[PDB]
Amino acid sequence: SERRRLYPPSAEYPDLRKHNNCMASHLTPAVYARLCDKTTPTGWTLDQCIQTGVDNPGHPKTVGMVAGDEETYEVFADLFDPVIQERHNGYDPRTMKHTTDLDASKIRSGYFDERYLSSRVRTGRSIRGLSLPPACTRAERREVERVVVDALSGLKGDLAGRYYRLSEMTEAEQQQLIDDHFLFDKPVSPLLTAAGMARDWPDARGIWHNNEKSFLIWVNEEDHTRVISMEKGGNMKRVFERFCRGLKEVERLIQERGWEFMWNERLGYILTCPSNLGTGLRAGVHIPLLSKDSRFPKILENLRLQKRGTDISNLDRLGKSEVELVQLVIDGVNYLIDCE
Amino acid sequence: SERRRLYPPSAEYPDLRKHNNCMASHLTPAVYARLCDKTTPTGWTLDQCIQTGVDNPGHPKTVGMVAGDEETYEVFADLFDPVIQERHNGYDPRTMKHTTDLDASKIRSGYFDERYLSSRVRTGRSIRGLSLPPACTRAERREVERVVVDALSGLKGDLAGRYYRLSEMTEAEQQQLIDDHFLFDKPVSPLLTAAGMARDWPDARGIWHNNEKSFLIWVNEEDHTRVISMEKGGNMKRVFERFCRGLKEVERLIQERGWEFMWNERLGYILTCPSNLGTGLRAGVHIPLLSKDSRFPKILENLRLQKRGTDISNLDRLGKSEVELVQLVIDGVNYLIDCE
Amino acid sequence: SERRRLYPPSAEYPDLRKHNNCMASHLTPAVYARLCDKTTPTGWTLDQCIQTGVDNPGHPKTVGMVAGDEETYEVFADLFDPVIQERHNGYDPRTMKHTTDLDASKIRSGYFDERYLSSRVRTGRSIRGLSLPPACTRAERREVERVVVDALSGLKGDLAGRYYRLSEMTEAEQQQLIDDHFLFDKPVSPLLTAAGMARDWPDARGIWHNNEKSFLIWVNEEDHTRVISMEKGGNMKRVFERFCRGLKEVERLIQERGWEFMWNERLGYILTCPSNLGTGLRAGVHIPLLSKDSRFPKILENLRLQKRGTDISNLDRLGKSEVELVQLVIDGVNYLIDCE
Amino acid sequence: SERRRLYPPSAEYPDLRKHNNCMASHLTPAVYARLCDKTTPTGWTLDQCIQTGVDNPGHPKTVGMVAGDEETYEVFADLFDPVIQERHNGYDPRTMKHTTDLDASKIRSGYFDERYLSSRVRTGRSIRGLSLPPACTRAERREVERVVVDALSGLKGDLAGRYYRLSEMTEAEQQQLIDDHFLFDKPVSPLLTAAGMARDWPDARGIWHNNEKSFLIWVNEEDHTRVISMEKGGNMKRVFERFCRGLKEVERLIQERGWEFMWNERLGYILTCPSNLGTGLRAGVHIPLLSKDSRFPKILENLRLQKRGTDISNLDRLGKSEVELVQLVIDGVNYLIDCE
Amino acid sequence: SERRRLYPPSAEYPDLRKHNNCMASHLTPAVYARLCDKTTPTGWTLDQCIQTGVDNPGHPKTVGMVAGDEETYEVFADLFDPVIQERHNGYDPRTMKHTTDLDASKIRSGYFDERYLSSRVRTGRSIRGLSLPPACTRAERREVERVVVDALSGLKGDLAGRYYRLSEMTEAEQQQLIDDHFLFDKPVSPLLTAAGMARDWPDARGIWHNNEKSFLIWVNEEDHTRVISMEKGGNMKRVFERFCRGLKEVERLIQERGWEFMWNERLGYILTCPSNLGTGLRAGVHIPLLSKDSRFPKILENLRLQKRGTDISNLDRLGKSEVELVQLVIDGVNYLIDCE
Amino acid sequence: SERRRLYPPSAEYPDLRKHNNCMASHLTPAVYARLCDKTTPTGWTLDQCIQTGVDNPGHPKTVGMVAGDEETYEVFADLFDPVIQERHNGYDPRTMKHTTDLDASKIRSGYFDERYLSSRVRTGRSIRGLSLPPACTRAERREVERVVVDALSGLKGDLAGRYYRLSEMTEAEQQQLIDDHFLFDKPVSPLLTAAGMARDWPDARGIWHNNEKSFLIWVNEEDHTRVISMEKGGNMKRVFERFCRGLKEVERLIQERGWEFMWNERLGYILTCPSNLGTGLRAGVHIPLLSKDSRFPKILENLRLQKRGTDISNLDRLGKSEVELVQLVIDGVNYLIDCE
């Protein structure tokens, strides 16, 4: 009968009395009740979005939310928008627009001292029309892999390379490349296992790298693609130039076959983790007189510069362009080399 | 979304831990879970059937079920069939068939001593295609009243009479006729108010009686119709003859306009209360040396005779015909007049 | 447009070229293509059933299947039936029926030497109408917890006890009871984490135990309930008697409120893991001259007896009744005490 | 809302207390209530079937029923079958099958005296896939006309002729041909105007006749087609031979383009009036010593011979073949010529 | 199940890496993905529109697109509009409107030297409500033929003529009239065959011409109709006058029976090929001192004049009216006769 | 409105008055009207099946039908079954079953004289779950190509080879391989072009051949696959052995990834052309004193042996096994070598 009553939405409300994250502080009963009936065309729902945060309370701050497809950020905008704004310290997606500028011809200077190890640029791209890793089926994941492999087969010159499937390579070489940061390990992190991003591992997961081992692409690990440009030394200019030309070539080759990267003006490039929205760029370096000092966290914070276990990196991804991302990093490290 | 979960049927199961009736002993969790999704074409559901029993626990035994239409007894047969069988001491509706025989020409003898007050025969009929009083709307109730009034307008001879609407007549004459048993009162019994049989009172409720005040019909009180033949004395033969000829005339006149009484072979005439199924007949008389004796309940029970506050009546309605009903009553009272 | 083509079912077929389990040997392309479109009324699908096996290849043998509700075993019978038959060494669900006999009055003898530690009997039950832990929502899990708690509140006498919620008890006492086998830990096993049985932990998960710490019930850990009867020594007679009376009382109390355990004649009591179907019983003891000998595995296998890290238990759950289960264990251990 | 109540079917029951038809005596409240909801795929309903009989009560006996398409006789079989059986004096459509035999090579003798005017054989056919005249739209009627005209354009030899549209020809020639029985008039009979068979007159109504004025076909007047073979004299042999060869040629030419006549084994050729079912044949002549005598109706009735205003025709159409129809007429008239 | 994933629209994107046409340069992945799901009410889709271009790459430039009905140009406007604008050198359908002026009374002068062979004016029309030749069924094509034939039967005077069906006439006369340009041939170009415009040939394809072979109509070859006015000499005045009066008469006669030509203000007369939109007019003549000269292509291009194998015709059909078309041709040829 | 009338099925009936094929003689108006509403799940209809025969009348006998998917032969069985029976001289699919026996270990003898050129064995296979070439989309065709290429990549030993895409190879080598029968040309045959089997050429069409040029596979030309085993000489045994082992290896490798060949017991291997059903095998040789004689066409007819332009082949495909096919050919040619 149609007279049977459904469970009220408040009966499904998560118990967040001991959680501390943006999801916990921005998921109110009104928002949960409003967004619980809604779903994306591919079937992604609010509970699947928030299951990561609910399962992992964390510590007093990760996002704990993922998107199943491109439409999610539009369907569940009332939930992601405050998180996107608070995580990126000011960027309101509804008000301001994001400008994408991958043209590296406008960079000024930038070269780290060789005494100071490896320079790395990383982004991530998703293929429009295919579900994101949290929601993708086996067929969609295989389609992503096929599209990426066929596109990368057309790379020529210094960008020529080979695709290495995880299922067909040994674990010893896998661990060796992981140590050399030329492979991604089986992600046992509960933050993504609860997200459903480790299903069917290692089917349709592989790596594509050029012969010089300087242009790295990770397929279906955390996003559809993870473009990495790496080099040893402090020649940030060459790394960024190769990164930009490789991204342009890859995009041209994917649109040759009719595929596009997910991208909108408001949010930029669409990725699974809302903290990776915008450009998804992470220009990093490996590099100790300014390690014991207690003012070093203060100056890195004031420089908009990120630091973690050895890995100097950035903070923002939305609002400011990729060239400005490296521009902040090179000048931020420039003020650090002088202090020695 | 379609992934929202409904309340499980066991969550709606009534609390019958302090109830004592056929509903309490025959409504098991399996039956309730099986029958809760089902509904009649007019929208009648199991909860509406059992609300009367749930609201009124009773005392250690009424039925506590009502039917909203004709299809109910077919849709919810798994619930009513054990109740119909236990209430009528053996009649299994699924196995045996009910035979209707209103032909009064096959009666033998029957006449009560004039010293021993008033003889009464009562049945009830429902018009096919219209919802029963528990589920009928205002339009359906008015349609029932119109059909009955137009049919009864064609009665001629000793059966000629007039229709008296309750809403257009005074309460004093109403109470007078109630005392003379020539009217039904505003039913304040909770066993039917909880059934929804007092809605919109007294709209579309009226009474039709002949000039001699011997043929009485009650409209929309407890069933669609309640045909009553009454006389003063012990001339049961004349009362039953008038009853049968009046029922035949009424049926012929209703089928002249295209309406039929609800009736099936398995259950007989369909009425709201399952205890009234079959023929719905109650041949009653008003009648004390056999009042103080404690064996009088025993002999009335052994005679298949029911006695209540001043009234001699019957027990069974299904399985045995209307002629047999009066046959049992006249012979049952015959063994009672001799004892004096 | 409806002229767009879906992905063929063979495009979603899992890559099982390295797996070694019942899933790998019984999931053929024909079966996968036939069962791909089907789904249970609650939305459970074949991919959700087989995700556990696909994600965890195992070693050369677990089942790798889970059920989302009661209808799964009927909807996906073509997949589970060969697995149920091969796992339980011969029991064909389609042909043979399962008989449930929890009456402990028919047990003959049974008493282990006190020199030989603890006796334990365990089963598991699921509440009909509510989804299984792999597919249950937060509301359904809370409903299960509420039903179990309200039922167990009515236990009286020796069976009287208290409910202890995991979310409201400290981790120190949790670990202490885990060591004493009076609690279940956060299940970090990848076999069930990939099944979705650790979602929203520890919401709606708790433990109910009597004052004497002999009747244990685990709520929403692996099944809806996990009834445990435990005692120190070798008096399996008392343990099984308490187990049977407690199960009878719990079933009566849940049926008072309108809830039933999932149960059908063909499969018995319905549980999430197909290896636990039938009775779900595991009568075990904790107990070394027969440890270094290499014939000890042979005699335990020939005795239909399962031995693991300290624990002596059984193998089968389907086809043979609970009384026969303990009878096998007591006689099996009896032949082991003599060898010393 | 879906809780609004429909009018009960008995509220739509026609008032037949003054009618005397086969419909009046065979339309009971049970049948009307059962058949009220049903409808043919083209939308024909029971009320449209019985409107002809209801509007024209008649005199104490026409059928008063029509069919809107081929499916009607199957959808409303419970209504038409008793009428078909009673009208055709015993032929039960449900049990008996109709055999069609248009082969005229098996006729024996047959020739009327030239002193005794005109010989006529008439049938009617309906094109499968197109609605009958009571229910046909303008497009369907035009399609019928186009199919018939294109088929008849292929007739060669003595069967060659021309199609004469009613709308494009004068009323004077129309009346002249009507008097000569070479045209059908504007049908003003209320027994078909109430049936909806005069809509859009004279659009798509025409007549096709051969040059010799011996093979006549009427299009869209009462049925889709009305094949008439006519000649002056008593040479019924030649008339029937021409009739049969013309029908065979017309059928072959319509199936050349992919059209078929409506025909089933149980009922034969499907026509609008149930009294015309089976063969639809009417072999008639125009022909006074046996006019004043009162025994003449008796001997025509005993001969299965029908006499009306000047005309000598048959009675039955179902159960007995076309050859037997003319055989009955020629022998019936033969016994009449001798009496002179 | 509805959880199965469809093929992403980019998986169906055509391989245009070798094609060179308006389809190749105007079909982007975004447009294809946006228009993939849309369809016309008759079922026409984008793939059916672009199949002609995809199957025939061409040479470095035809359109390669066809419309299945009138709604196509509205449903797939995002695809056809850039093509309509680029093909017709500037006419933007979205902004500018098309004015239809067939009135030939406004022509000034116009007469070619008899020494310089035949004058021809051609258009094409489609009947509203019937699918275009690429998408029309057999029934729709036959309906088009019937409507055109019935309309043309009413032409009187000089315009009186006869309809000649291709299927019922010999191939020798067909080839003779093709050589005399008084008939069309079976579509053998791969452009028409791949578009689906040769199905069921030659069913429902025919030709209508007046007795003088001066007013030609081609039915169901490339469009629903193709009106041709032809004469020998250079008296384009008479040819255009006859063309105008014939088109007016044909439109009036089709509108008498209730049919209309497809026509909207934005695009004009609707035809299958987008290059024929607007007026669909082609005023051509058959006509060598200006043949060997290399400046002749330059002057014909500068004169908006189109020259092909012997034939002198126009370029544009949208934006400028029919009278302007013939005015351009007569003045264009006038500047060519003087050069001799 | 829903009262609008559809075109009757007979209005869409093809004009077959000048056709001579199994389609013309077996498509009756009743069959066409019955099968016109039906459609396969992928949208294939009867008109698409019969368009090939309708467009190409042929000469007095090809089949003229194709199937769009596997379900077609079941959905339109009433049309294909008589044609399958008449084409294969007696095999009634509804009555008898087809047995598949590719085991070549049971062949006895078989070796043609080296003086007598090249021996060839050919079959064709379709991948279950993907539409046939007449109805396949671009995505389905690309999926077929991907599955076949990935399967054939696993071939090892003498069966190792390379895949050659048509779009990426030159026309000169294409024509050279066509002459050597190591490639299929652009099929310009109107029989298949009208079937829709040349759409998007040459997208997803390629050839796979081993290094020795003895094992040939044609992808997406006429069927999904066309397995060919070829060698020079009369060593039919080696050719058939290689053919059988290659087919077994290919089937095993496709079911490794989860794909199956279309195959049912009644019809055997499912292919587009009904004349290729069953085994689809054609054991051919290239081979003249028995060419001038007029008895030469007769003996091969008595040998169930087909002869065409230089080629010796077979007739039957259904009813008799692949081993029996070559057995008939080798013995049939054996009786031909002796005559010399």
CSV table of N, CA and C in Angstrom, one decimal, chain E residues 265-300:
chain,number,residue,atom,x,y,z
E,265,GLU,N,9.2,31.4,-40.0
E,265,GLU,CA,9.8,32.7,-40.3
E,265,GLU,C,11.3,32.7,-40.2
E,266,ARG,N,11.8,32.0,-39.3
E,266,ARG,CA,13.3,32.0,-39.1
E,266,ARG,C,14.0,31.3,-40.2
E,267,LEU,N,13.5,30.1,-40.6
E,267,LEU,CA,14.3,29.3,-41.6
E,267,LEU,C,13.6,29.3,-43.0
E,268,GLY,N,12.4,29.7,-43.1
E,268,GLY,CA,11.7,29.6,-44.4
E,268,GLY,C,11.1,28.2,-44.6
E,269,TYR,N,11.1,27.8,-45.9
E,269,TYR,CA,10.6,26.5,-46.2
E,269,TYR,C,11.5,25.4,-45.7
E,270,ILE,N,11.0,24.4,-45.0
E,270,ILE,CA,11.8,23.3,-44.4
E,270,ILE,C,12.1,22.2,-45.4
E,271,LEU,N,13.3,21.9,-45.6
E,271,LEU,CA,13.7,20.8,-46.5
E,271,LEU,C,14.7,19.9,-45.7
E,272,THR,N,15.1,18.7,-46.3
E,272,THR,CA,15.9,17.8,-45.7
E,272,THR,C,17.4,18.3,-45.6
E,273,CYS,N,17.9,18.8,-46.7
E,273,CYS,CA,19.3,19.3,-46.7
E,273,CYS,C,19.3,20.7,-46.1
E,274,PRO,N,20.1,21.0,-45.1
E,274,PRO,CA,20.2,22.4,-44.6
E,274,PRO,C,20.7,23.4,-45.6
E,275,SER,N,21.4,23.0,-46.6
E,275,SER,CA,21.8,23.9,-47.7
E,275,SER,C,20.7,24.3,-48.6
E,276,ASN,N,19.5,23.6,-48.5
E,276,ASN,CA,18.4,24.0,-49.3
E,276,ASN,C,17.3,24.8,-48.6
E,277,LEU,N,17.6,25.2,-47.3
E,277,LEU,CA,16.7,25.9,-46.5
E,277,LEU,C,16.4,27.3,-47.1
E,278,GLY,N,15.3,27.9,-46.6
E,278,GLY,CA,15.0,29.3,-47.1
E,278,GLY,C,13.9,29.2,-48.2
E,279,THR,N,14.4,29.4,-49.4
E,279,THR,CA,13.5,29.3,-50.6
E,279,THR,C,13.7,28.0,-51.3
E,280,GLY,N,14.9,27.4,-51.3
E,280,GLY,CA,15.1,26.2,-52.0
E,280,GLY,C,15.1,26.4,-53.5
E,281,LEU,N,15.3,27.6,-54.0
E,281,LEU,CA,15.1,28.0,-55.4
E,281,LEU,C,16.5,27.8,-56.1
E,282,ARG,N,16.4,27.4,-57.3
E,282,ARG,CA,17.6,27.3,-58.2
E,282,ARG,C,17.2,27.6,-59.6
E,283,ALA,N,17.4,28.8,-60.0
E,283,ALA,CA,17.1,29.3,-61.4
E,283,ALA,C,18.3,29.0,-62.2
E,284,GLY,N,18.2,28.1,-63.2
E,284,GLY,CA,19.3,27.6,-63.9
E,284,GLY,C,19.1,27.7,-65.4
E,285,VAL,N,20.1,27.8,-66.2
E,285,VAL,CA,20.1,27.8,-67.7
E,285,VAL,C,21.2,26.9,-68.2
E,286,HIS,N,21.0,26.4,-69.4
E,286,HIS,CA,22.0,25.6,-70.1
E,286,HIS,C,22.7,26.4,-71.2
E,287,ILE,N,24.0,26.6,-71.1
E,287,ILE,CA,24.7,27.4,-72.1
E,287,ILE,C,26.1,26.7,-72.3
E,288,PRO,N,31.8,29.3,-76.7
E,288,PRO,CA,32.4,29.0,-75.4
E,288,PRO,C,33.7,29.8,-75.2
E,289,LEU,N,33.7,31.1,-75.6
E,289,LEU,CA,34.9,31.9,-75.5
E,289,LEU,C,35.3,32.1,-74.0
E,290,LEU,N,34.4,32.1,-73.1
E,290,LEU,CA,34.6,32.2,-71.7
E,290,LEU,C,34.8,30.9,-70.9
E,291,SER,N,35.2,29.9,-71.6
E,291,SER,CA,35.5,28.6,-71.0
E,291,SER,C,36.9,28.3,-70.8
E,292,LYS,N,37.8,28.6,-71.8
E,292,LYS,CA,39.2,28.4,-71.6
E,292,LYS,C,39.9,29.4,-70.7
E,293,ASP,N,39.3,30.6,-70.6
E,293,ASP,CA,39.9,31.7,-69.8
E,293,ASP,C,39.8,31.3,-68.4
E,294,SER,N,40.9,31.7,-67.7
E,294,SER,CA,41.0,31.4,-66.2
E,294,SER,C,40.3,32.4,-65.4
E,295,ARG,N,39.9,33.6,-65.9
E,295,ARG,CA,39.2,34.6,-65.2
E,295,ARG,C,37.7,34.3,-65.1
E,296,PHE,N,37.2,33.3,-65.8
E,296,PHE,CA,35.8,33.0,-65.8
E,296,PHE,C,35.3,32.5,-64.4
E,297,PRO,N,36.1,31.6,-63.7
E,297,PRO,CA,35.7,31.3,-62.4
E,297,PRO,C,35.7,32.5,-61.5
E,298,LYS,N,36.6,33.4,-61.6
E,298,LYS,CA,36.7,34.6,-60.8
E,298,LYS,C,35.4,35.5,-61.0
E,299,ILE,N,35.0,35.7,-62.2
E,299,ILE,CA,33.9,36.6,-62.5
E,299,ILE,C,32.6,35.9,-62.1
E,300,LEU,N,32.5,34.6,-62.3
E,300,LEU,CA,31.3,33.9,-61.8
E,300,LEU,C,31.1,33.9,-60.3
